[PDB]
Write a protein that binds this ligand. Structure first.
Ligand SMILES: CCCCCCCCCCCCCCCCCC(=O)OC[C@H](COP(=O)([O-])OCC(O)COP(=O)([O-])OC[C@@H](COC(=O)CCCCCCCCCCCCCCCCC)OC(=O)CCCCCCCCCCCCCCCCC)OC(=O)CCCCCCCCCCCCCCCCC
Ligand code: BCL
Ligand code: BCL
Ligand SMILES: CC[C@H]1c2cc3[nH]c4c(c3C)C(=O)[C@H](C(=O)OC)c4c3nc(cc4[nH]c(cc(n2)[C@@H]1C)c(C(C)=O)c4C)[C@@H](C)[C@@H]3CCC(=O)OC/C=C(\C)CCC[C@H](C)CCC[C@H](C)CCCC(C)C
Ligand SMILES: CC[C@H]1c2cc3[nH]c4c(c3C)C(=O)[C@H](C(=O)OC)c4c3nc(cc4[nH]c(cc(n2)[C@@H]1C)c(C(C)=O)c4C)[C@@H](C)[C@@H]3CCC(=O)OC/C=C(\C)CCC[C@H](C)CCC[C@H](C)CCCC(C)C
Ligand SMILES: COC1=C(OC)C(=O)C(C/C=C(\C)CC/C=C(\C)CC/C=C(\C)CC/C=C(\C)CC/C=C(\C)CC/C=C(\C)CC/C=C(\C)CC/C=C(\C)CC/C=C(\C)CCC=C(C)C)=C(C)C1=O
Ligand SMILES: COC1=C(OC)C(=O)C(C/C=C(\C)CC/C=C(\C)CC/C=C(\C)CC/C=C(\C)CC/C=C(\C)CC/C=C(\C)CC/C=C(\C)CC/C=C(\C)CC/C=C(\C)CCC=C(C)C)=C(C)C1=O
Ligand SMILES: COC(C)(C)C(=O)C/C=C(\C)CC/C=C(\C)CC/C=C(\C)CCCC/C(C)=C/CC[C@H](C)CC/C=C(\C)CCC=C(C)C
Ligand SMILES: CCCCCCCCCCCC[N+](C)(C)[O-]
Ligand SMILES: CCCCCCCCCCCC[N+](C)(C)[O-]
Ligand SMILES: CCCCCCCCCCCC[N+](C)(C)[O-]
Ligand SMILES: CCCCCCCCCCCC[N+](C)(C)[O-]
Ligand SMILES: CCCCCCCCCCCC[N+](C)(C)[O-]
Ligand SMILES: CCCCCCCCCCCC[N+](C)(C)[O-]
Ligand SMILES: [Fe+3]
Ligand SMILES: [K+]
Lengths: 302, 240, 281
């Protein structure tokens, strides 16, 4: 049985690694967490330290308030009965105001008001978390690639819960907070707009979603295949190309006629993934604002 | 129609992106060459990107790419055919000469450094506080090659200090000297370490490093390349 | 033409079949025995599609559609124009795919690298075979397989899914989607992390893996590491396709009612099935 480097044979441990400092405010770093042998079969064993400034505490607090707002309404729907809570966990749902309240904030607590409170907490949690991804990178001097990429995910979410409800004229267009209900909403969204398979941006969205699995299977497999030449040490392979990066390039050149570089492959990777939600958010945003029925639309602009 | 404009505009952007991305992936290996090393006449439809410059840390200088490409080593190979496209036969011993699946690149003859300026990889006996924390400890096991003979014994683990992973086994040979074996190319068993890539007689030819407590990028490539090349070139001595 | 560093790797050896008979390149492409096979299966398969595109009668890519045999034919053969072309094109497609992978194995052996890439690709091949072969045979007819047409194959996805209600409720479909979503998330992060290190703020030195670990630990309190992230991407993508194939292999065979109703086994567990209140009481 030849070794494949999917799981570690021998873990080694040393002093807890406290990190690079650069311009980080060390007073906002926690201590180091425990070490997980379980995780160390696959990745790093070290947990922590985490950084927790004001933005991070703000974000964690609104995020929990969002969760807890949903969870209290779920208990209400359960008549406070724990067995009913567990039984119907996936059927509960915190739903937005009815269409007649438009974009207003008048709707009663039990009829959409609570949804707007939860959504407000979610809005603050995500946007403050975005600021973290930018600021943590700044403090280390790194590029802002993570924060720009996160913006693409935030785009689709903003379009679903905020920008399209506003453009459409009522909060009732937004997504409800519930396991099965948000699946019901999704199916219903497609039916009401004439089958999203005719939305050309849904098709692009799928291509990139499939493509991300294609590309990560490729990239992940490639790096593991050349990890016998230290291939996963990618930053130094960029600064000083090794035989790992050359064999990786030549596998793909010989297989399909062209290839990447150790750096360039990561530009393929960031854009494959980012375009999923980019084209996705456009496709949803155009739906009902501009195009009532994608089948109809495709009959004319196909 | 606004949706018709959005989709037209997107396919344009996508063509620009793929163009950008393809030219970014030309920063190494290009211009293309004939088998004799001269520039090929057909470079494909994509032009070379404008150069970029990486600032390396710890006073290691810069890298500008694209730039003049040289192998910076002799290549012991010769044509087997009178036209392009055919394999090139080793003119000597391909394991010793570092060609084919045994190839190595002329990387800098310095060690990789962690973010604090220290050597990234050290033998574990020289790594304060590092120890084996899970799985079978290989230190002390005998080392068996693909001819099912014993080639040496494990005397240490070379570890990646900032990432805390094992990267090499240090194996002691019958003459008292040692060699590095890549961790991804050994099988740690209960009573042995098994190396399918090398037969026992090939252990002594593993390239040797110049310092007992560090290994340079150039030396890792010669080591990793040699061991991997045994998969093809040691096949006449591999059993079942 | 060769990449500047390529010649040293273009040695004899690696082949599984034919010795050195096909051990050569065409421009950048390696050939090998399994390149000749791939080319043959692919050329034939494409020829038959271009044919089928006349037995049906158009040259528009958005219309060309090669349908499988109707359900009446069961698991037997069929005349070319009534599903036989589909069956022959399916054998060619399987042969091209399998031979593409085996050609990848040969490239792996020449290059001294591991077999992880064709192993991964094999998962894609088995998802395809689940849809065109394993599931149709288990169900009794080639007609349950999908047609080879850009838009008609989407037609098939909707008809097949709505046969069981909203397909969202297939719990193996749910796990498959979860892996797809986490894969794309891990890909955005991984690409962004390496790039943010190699391309720091203007004028700074390249960052190290130590900065990449510090970044993620500062952000979420855990960093999987440079070996782990590549292991992770492989596992998430491969798991997504495994559960994809599973979610379809069980659909119409062991489960064939409306998938939403599957979930009643939970609700109707005895200790709470009859407690009033909530949504289901
Ligand atoms: C409606 C949509 C609204 C949706 C909102 C969601 C927004 C999503 C943003 C996603 C961006 C992820 C990419 C990450 C990245 O590469 O970051 C680079 C870079 C990293 O920043 P850094 O850390 O400061 O850089 C440090 C290094 O020195 C620099 O590091 P570096 O070297 O990695 O950076 C260089 C980088 C610089 O990257 C950028 O400048 C990013 C540009 C973002 C583009 C977003 C556009 C969305 C597409 C809309 C399509 C239309 C549909 C209708 O270069 C590129 O990546 C080149 C981009 C390719 C351009 C293709 C042009 C095609 C048009 C021509 C057609 C001709 C064809 C003929 C036929 O980020 C930026 O440049 C900032 C962009 C932020 C945009 C926010 C916009 C929201 C308002
Ligand atoms: C996977 C689960 C479902 C399915 C559901 C969907 C849905 C839902 C959608 C698609 C979409 C597409 N599907 Mg389909 N599709 C399936 C099986 C297949 C198979 C196959 C042999 O198994 C193929 C080749 C395709 C091919 C395609 C493309 C036409 C398109 C974008 C895919 C993409 O970018 O992926 C990622 C891959 C890459 C980025 C790599 C490049 C792949 C290229 C684009 C494939 C071209 C194939 C070509 C058109 C036909 C064969 C060429 C031969 C030489 C004749 N599908 C099964 C039945 N497919 C989307 C679309 O827009 O359809 C109109 C879409 O919305
Ligand atoms: C019957 C159902 C309908 C349909 C209805 C819809 C609808 C409706 C939508 C999609 C969308 C998507 N569809 Mg469709 N879809 C159908 C059929 C398919 C098929 C198929 C095989 O048939 C496939 C493969 C797809 C594929 C997809 C994806 C390409 C796309 C979502 C991208 C993504 O990453 O979202 C997942 C990513 C996100 C939701 C972004 C999340 C970002 C935020 C910021 C994260 C916040 C986290 C929060 C704080 C909580 C933290 C929790 C703790 C971490 C624990 N659809 C049919 C036709 N589909 C979307 C789209 O873009 O369409 C154009 C969309 O809105
Ligand atoms: C480019 C497309 C993909 C994308 C990208 C993306 N997402 C991102 C990023 C990027 C580049 C980030 O930088 C960011 C991040 O920090 O990742 C680590 C993020 C992220 N994407 C997330 C989720 C997410 N991404 C998704 C999808 C996608 N993300 C796309 C596939 C999805 C879906 C629906 O598919 C989800 C659910 C988060 C992990 C993170 C953003 C975090 C955030 O906004 O947090 C604010 C909330 C809090 C600080 C607190 C919330 C509190 C919890 C609800 C507590 C309850 C938990 C309970 C105690 C237990 C629950 C069960 C188990 C956890 C035990
Ligand atoms: C398992 C995880 C993911 C995966 C992995 C993966 N795919 C891979 C690889 C890997 C690891 C490769 O090494 C291999 C490759 O070389 O990639 C560049 C490949 C590849 N994945 C491809 C496509 C692809 N992968 C997909 C998905 C996935 N690939 C998974 C999500 C998808 C979709 C729908 O999501 C597609 C379309 C190719 C780019 C390539 C394999 C190329 C190949 O086999 O070439 C030989 C065959 C030909 C050149 C032509 C054959 C034509 C037939 C004879 C006739 C047509 C038959 C077909 C059924 C018609 C269908 C019509 C459509 C409208 C539906
Ligand atoms: C770190 O390393 C890494 C690299 O390298 C340094 C890489 O390159 C790559 C590879 C990744 C890229 C280059 C990124 C872009 C890739 C994608 C988005 C994946 C999708 C790819 C395609 C859509 C192109 C596929 C084209 C194919 C399959 C070839 C076309 C085939 C022909 C025209 C002829 C087919 C050849 C035959 C029939 C065989 C025999 C030849 C004869 C002519 C006979 C990875 C993963 C990597 O991790
Ligand atoms: C240069 O390198 C780099 C590193 O290092 C230097 C890295 O550190 C990292 C950073 C990566 C990390 C630190 C890891 C964090 C990444 C993620 C957040 C994505 C992966 C998340 C997990 C692995 C945790 C969650 C895993 C789960 C839950 C998988 C199992 C799923 C299920 C089976 C259940 C889900 C389905 C549900 C909930 C529905 C219930 C269904 C029923 C049937 C009941 C990157 C990106 C990197 O690039
Ligand atoms: C044990 O029980 C307790 C009580 C302790 C718990 O804690 C249990 C908790 C739970 C059971 C919680 C379970 C939670 C869920 C099921 C939530 C599931 C959520 C989803 C599936 C989300 C679907 C999509 C959500 C979207 C698309 C949201 C968009 C949000 C908007 C972008 C925000 C826009 C802002 C608005 C409308 C506010 C407007 C006002 C301003 C001031 C800006
Ligand atoms: C996936 C794991 C992410 C979990 C985040 C762990 C954060 C570790 C914080 C530990 C705090 C230790 N200490 C001593 C300060 O209490
Ligand atoms: C801040 C505490 C740091 C040390 C914690 C160590 C945890 C136990 C070590 C063995 C790991 C076993 N397990 C089950 C946690 O994986
Ligand atoms: C802390 C919440 C921040 C304000 C944003 C949420 C607005 C919710 C309005 C709830 C409706 C109140 N009322 C009186 C109409 O029932
Ligand atoms: C950055 C990677 C780019 C890869 C491009 C993939 C193109 C897939 C084509 C799908 C066509 C979708 N649509 C709507 C036109 O039908
Ligand atoms: C959008 C999917 C279609 C892409 C398939 C074509 C891949 C091109 C490979 C060409 C090889 C380069 N070249 C010109 C030397 O042959
Ligand atoms: C959908 C992604 C695939 C797009 C194809 C990218 C272009 C391939 C051309 C590569 C050029 C190879 N060459 C000749 C420069 O070596
Ligand atoms: Fe990588
Ligand atoms: K030690």
């Amino acid at each position: 049985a030849e070794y494949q480097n999917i799981f570690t044979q021998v873990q080694v441990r040393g002093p807890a690694d406290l990190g690079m400092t650069e311009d980080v405010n060390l007073a906002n770093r926690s201590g180091v967490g425990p070490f997980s042998t379980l995780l160390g079969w696959f990745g790093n064993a070290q947990l922590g330290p985490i950084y927790l400034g004001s933005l991070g505490v703000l974000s964690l607090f609104s995020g929990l308030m969002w969760f807890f707002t949903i969870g209290i309404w779920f208990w209400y729907q359960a008549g406070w009965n724990p067995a009913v809570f567990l039984r119907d966990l996936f059927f509960f749902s915190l739903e937005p105001p009815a269409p007649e309240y438009g974009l207003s904030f008048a709707a009663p607590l039990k009829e959409g008001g609570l949804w707007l409170i939860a959504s407000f907490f979610m809005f603050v949690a995500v946007w403050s978390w975005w600021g973290r991804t930018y600021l943590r990178a700044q403090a280390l001097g790194m590029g802002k690639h993570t924060a720009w990429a996160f913006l693409s995910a935030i785009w689709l979410w903003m379009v679903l819960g905020f920008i399209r409800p506003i453009l459409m004229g009522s909060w009732s267009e937004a997504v409800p907070y519930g396991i099965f209900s948000h699946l019901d909403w999704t199916n219903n969204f497609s039916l009401v707009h004439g089958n999203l398979f005719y939305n050309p941006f849904h098709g692009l969205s799928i291509a990139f979603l499939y493509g991300s699995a294609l590309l990560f299977a490729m990239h992940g497999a490639t790096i593991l295949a050349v990890s016998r030449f230290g291939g996963e040490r990618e930053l130094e392979q960029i600064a000083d190309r090794g035989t790992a990066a050359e064999r990786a390039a030549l596998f793909w050149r010989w297989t399909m006629g062209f290839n990447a570089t150790m750096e360039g492959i990561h530009r393929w990777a960031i854009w494959m993934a980012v375009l999923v939600t980019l084209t996705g958010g456009i496709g949803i945003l155009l739906s009902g604002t501009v195009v009532d029925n994608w089948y109809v639309w495709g009959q004319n602009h196909g | 129609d606004l949706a018709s404009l959005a989709i037209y505009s997107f396919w344009i952007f996508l063509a620009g992106l793929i163009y950008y991305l393809q030219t970014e992936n030309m920063r190494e290996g290009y211009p293309l060459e004939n088998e004799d090393g001269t520039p090929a006449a057909n470079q494909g439809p994509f032009p070379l990107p404008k150069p970029k410059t990486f600032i390396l840390p710890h006073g290691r200088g810069t890298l500008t790419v694209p730039g003049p490409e040289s192998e910076d080593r002799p290549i012991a190979l010769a044509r087997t055919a009178v036209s392009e496209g055919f394999p090139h036969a080793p003119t000597g011993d391909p394991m010793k000469d570092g060609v084919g699946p045994a190839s190595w690149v002329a990387r800098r003859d310095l060690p990789e450094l962690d973010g604090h300026g220290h050597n990234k990889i050290k033998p574990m006996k020289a790594a304060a506080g590092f120890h084996v924390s899970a799985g079978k400890n290989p230190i002390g096991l005998p080392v068996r090659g693909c001819d099912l003979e014993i080639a040496g014994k494990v005397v240490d683990i070379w570890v990646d200090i900032p990432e805390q992973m094992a990267r090499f086994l240090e194996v002691e040979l019958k003459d008292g000297s040692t060699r590095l074996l890549p961790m991804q190319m050994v099988k740690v068993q209960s009573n042995r370490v098994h190396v399918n890539a090398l037969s026992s007689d090939l252990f002594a030819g593993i390239p040797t490093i110049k310092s007992p407590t560090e290994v340079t990028l150039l030396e890792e490539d010669k080591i990793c390349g040699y061991v991997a090349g045994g998969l093809m070139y040691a096949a006449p001595k591999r059993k079942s | 033409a060769l990449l500047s560093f390529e010649r040293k790797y273009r040695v004899p050896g690696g082949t599984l079949v034919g010795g050195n008979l096909f051990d050569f390149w065409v421009g950048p492409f390696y050939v090998g025995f399994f390149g000749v096979c791939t080319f043959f299966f692919a050329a034939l398969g494409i020829i038959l599609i271009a044919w089928s595109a006349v037995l049906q009668g158009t040259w528009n890519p958005q219309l060309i559609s090669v349908y499988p045999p109707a359900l009446e034919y069961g698991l037997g053969g069929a005349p070319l124009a009534k599903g036989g072309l589909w069956q022959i094109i399916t054998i060619c497609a399987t042969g091209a795919f399998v031979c593409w992978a085996l050609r990848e194995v040969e490239i792996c052996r020449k290059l001294g690298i591991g077999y992880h890439i064709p192993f991964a690709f094999a998962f894609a091949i088995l998802a395809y075979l689940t849809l065109v072969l394993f599931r149709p045979v288990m169900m009794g007819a080639w007609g349950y397989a999908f047609p080879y047409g850009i838009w008609t194959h989407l037609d098939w996805v909707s008809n097949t899914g709505y046969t069981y209600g909203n397909f969202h409720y297939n719990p193996a479909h749910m796990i498959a989607i979860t892996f797809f979503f986490t894969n794309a998330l891990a890909l955005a992060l991984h690409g962004a992390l390496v790039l943010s290190a190699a391309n720091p703020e203007k004028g700074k030195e390249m960052r190290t893996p130590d900065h990449e670990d510090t970044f993620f630990r500062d952000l979420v309190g855990y960093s999987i590491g440079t070996l782990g992230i590549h292991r992770l991407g492989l596992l998430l993508s491969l798991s997504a396709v495994f559960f994809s194939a599973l979610c379809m292999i069980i659909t119409g065979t062991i489960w064939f009612d409306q998938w939403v109703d599957w979930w009643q086994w939970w609700v109707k567990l005895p200790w709470w099935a009859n407690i009033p209140g909530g949504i289901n009481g």
